[PDB]
Ligand binder design. Structure first.
Ligand SMILES: N[C@@H](CCC(=O)N[C@@H](CS)C(=O)NCC(=O)O)C(=O)O
Ligand SMILES: N[C@@H](CCC(=O)N[C@@H](CS)C(=O)NCC(=O)O)C(=O)O
Ligand SMILES: [Zn+2]
Ligand SMILES: [Zn+2]
Ligand SMILES: [Zn+2]
Ligand SMILES: [Zn+2]
Ligand SMILES: [Zn+2]
Ligand SMILES: [Zn+2]
Ligand SMILES: [Zn+2]
Ligand SMILES: [Zn+2]
Lengths: 318, 318
């Protein structure tokens, strides 16, 4: 079987929680593959070609990185109930972007303060904690994101939570845009879920009762039905599979060349905010919102690795 | 008279256009004070204490910097029609933030390309153009914002414009959240207005007919009624006036000390994204969303300079 949805993630990851909750909302069964929290990730690299962030979605030999894109893929498969109401398209898109960048960075900083950090690392060996701290520092080497100072983090949280509370207090809708959550609900949710996990500093949430109630409604979607799969099993599946763009049916798909890179061009794709690890391959998938690069790994053969455009940089190799 | 609304701005400034359009929407008469496009600004510094960005709103001896805060002040004065519908509070706040940062930075980069830049500088002396280029480079010295590379700028614009077009094409509402514009409409608008001004590259807008129609509806609000005032007249007015926090009525206003800086503390306030010029004074105004610092200038006496919290950093002087 090479059409199962295989999510590569770990339990304590907020961005992984976002994807798992969306899976619940879509009532989409999936396979669960645990990845390491820190480098190195030798069972991950043959799939992603260097991208080390979590989570990513594997379907056969197609590897979809970033939750903004994973959500779009899941929407493609089960469009109902939708994450992207047409009548809220721009507002939901922009709010989700802000939530998954600026808001998340404030939550990370807020939780990174001494009491918060102590709460997060509570049941873990001191070896791992030190390595985690070093791993995340190296992760910030190339970018601009995920380095909001504590005082600005606190203000962004206080200001935003009050606006969130105000909106919900009107009692007009149970989610941000109506009686169904949108992508923006999920993006905001995991940032706040991360704070809730930082037990010693979670009190900031409790000062906002309506926000807490909304979180409870979001949590109710669950994570659908999952079964574990080993990292090795996932690699075998990618190896046996042919990427969609290389099948006779998928090869005729429209290729957006307006961006000035023709099909087949050797490129790299890299995140721009942090973890700026370049992934190299041939540009074989190009849409308005996303790209896909064909690469060849000795252990999985050919895979195509997909990224959204926003938050990433595509450059010609030369 | 020391209760007129005095906007310090210049014609070609997108952020100034945002404030002027909001003034039209509120039907709020104002006084117009032209400031220089580039440094130095000796008629501005006695008011702002170092903040060199445009626009700012003066009311007597209170100086309100940043359009996010100017909008809140204008809302305080004419709350109807509102910019901040309670039932859309968080969505409008977040979307406006994203529009006034990420989206604006993509528009700036997009317009900064050779043909775009040529269009913008068309009727201007080559002296000024060179100085402008140097001025804006020095402006980016301390921050992270306003440096989106052209290819990423193009993708952010294409992706967002399609979502905007999709939302409007449903025909459900004439503005982003209903039959009245919100703060988010104004924030998105000026970024696109800036692109429209870059004649040679404005065609990107025309590929999105519904977005163009929405821009036309926004433009219709006009700029209310304005009269010119000289920079010197504005300085005299600040000089004669007493800041609200120093009046008997305003002195009892609630002071938010939860952020850990008591009233009277000597601080600096500085933008975090670009133009990171620190403004020093005593912290005498503190709310959840904003701060105000009392300073003394030999030429205007005491003024209080106000900033929003989000996008700024407040630090104790020592
Ligand atoms: N924009 C990315 C952000 C992903 C992200 O930052 N994930 C965190 C985990 S919560 C991460 O990658 N940490 C480094 C790692 O997993 O090795 C997305 O939406 O998927
Ligand atoms: N966040 C600020 C941004 C203001 C801004 O960047 N203004 C531009 C003018 S369009 C600027 O300050 N350029 C430098 C200058 O005016 O000297 C706001 O919303 O007011
Ligand atoms: Zn994480
Ligand atoms: Zn969970
Ligand atoms: Zn299904
Ligand atoms: Zn097994
Ligand atoms: Zn400008
Ligand atoms: Zn105008
Ligand atoms: Zn009035
Ligand atoms: Zn006069």
């Amino acid at each position: 079987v090479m059409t199962e949805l295989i999510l590569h993630h770990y339990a304590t990851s907020p961005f992984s929680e976002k994807a798992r909750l969306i899976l619940g909302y879509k009532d989409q069964p999936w396979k669960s593959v645990t990845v390491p929290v820190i480098l190195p990730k030798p069972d991950v690299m043959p799939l992603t070609g260097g991208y080390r962030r979590t989570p990513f979605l594997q379907i056969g030999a197609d590897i979809y990185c970033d939750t903004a894109l994973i959500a779009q893929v899941l929407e493609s498969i089960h469009p109902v109930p939708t994450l992207y109401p047409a009548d809220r398209a721009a507002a939901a898109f922009a709010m989700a972007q802000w939530a998954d960048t600026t808001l998340f960075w404030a939550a990370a900083s807020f939780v990174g303060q001494p009491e918060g950090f102590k709460s997060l690392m509570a049941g873990l060996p001191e070896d791992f904690v030190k390595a985690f701290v070093e791993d995340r520092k190296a992760m910030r080497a190339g970018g601009t994101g995920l380095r909001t100072p504590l005082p600005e983090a606190v203000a962004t949280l206080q200001v935003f939570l009050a606006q969130l509370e105000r909106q919900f207090a009107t009692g007009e809708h149970i989610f941000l845009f109506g009686e169904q959550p949108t992508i923006a609900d999920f993006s905001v949710y995991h940032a706040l879920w991360f704070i809730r996990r930082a037990t010693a500093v979670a009190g900031i949430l409790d000062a906002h009762p309506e926000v807490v109630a909304w979180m409870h409604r979001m949590a109710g979607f669950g994570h659908a039905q999952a079964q574990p799969m080993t990292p090795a099993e996932a690699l075998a599946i990618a190896r046996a599979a042919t990427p969609r763009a290389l099948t006779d049916a998928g090869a005729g798909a429209d290729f957006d060349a307006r961006y000035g890179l023709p099909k087949g061009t050797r490129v790299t794709v890299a995140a721009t905010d942090y973890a700026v690890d370049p992934v190299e391959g041939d540009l074989v998938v190009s849409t308005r919102d996303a790209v896909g690069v064909l690469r060849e790994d000795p252990r999985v053969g050919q895979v195509v690795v997909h990224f959204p455009r926003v938050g990433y940089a595509v450059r010609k190799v030369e």
